Amino acid sequence: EVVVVAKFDYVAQQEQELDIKKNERLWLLDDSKSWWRVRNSMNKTGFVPSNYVERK
Amino acid sequence: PPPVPNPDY
């Protein structure tokens, strides 16, 4: 039930990463490391840089 | 914008 909002665009460079756009809302799934695992509104998941998203 | 952290996922 935790939301993050992207602060910057991120174009994925590996299969496990996720493309995000600035202002996109995402579900936060795992915040244990410096890259966080998120789910988007297309029901896709992947890792993004934790400093590119803001916990709401 | 800042650099990404070193990936360790």
Author numbering:
A (entry chain A): 2 to 57
B (entry chain D): 180 to 188
Lines from the paper:
The complex of Nck1-SH3.1 with minimal CD3ϵ peptide 180PPPVPNPDY188 was crystallized from the same conditions as the apo-form but in orthorhombic space group I212121 with different packing interactions. Slight structural changes compared with the apo-SH3.1 domain are apparent (RMSD 0.45 Å). The most prominent, peptide-induced structural changes pertain to the side chains of SH3.1 residues Phe-11, Trp-38, Phe-50, Pro-52, Asn-54, and Tyr-55. An important exception is the indole ring of Trp-38, which swings by ∼3 Å and becomes locked between CD3ϵ side chains Val-183, Pro-184, and Pro-186. The CD3ϵ side chain Pro-181 packs on top of SH3.1 side chain Phe-11, and CD3ϵ Pro-184 wedges between SH3.1 side chains Ser-37 and Asn-54. A notable exception is CD3ϵ side chain Tyr-188 hydrogen-bonding to Nck1 side chain Glu-20. In addition to the hydrogen bond, Tyr-188 also stacks on Phe-50 in Nck1, making this position a selectivity hotspot: Tyr-188 is the first tyrosine in the ITAM of CD3ϵ and needs to be unphosphorylated for Nck1 to bind to CD3ϵ (16). The crystal structure explains this necessity: for steric reasons, phosphorylation of Tyr-188 would abolish all interactions with Glu-20 and Phe-50. Thus, selectivity of CD3ϵ for Nck-SH3.1 is established mainly by hydrophobic contacts from residues in the SH3.1 domain acting on the CD3ϵ hotspots Val-183, Pro-184, Pro-186, and Tyr-188. Despite this selectivity, CD3ϵ appears to retain significant flexibility when bound to Nck1, as judged from a comparison of the two peptide-SH3.1 complexes in the asymmetric unit.
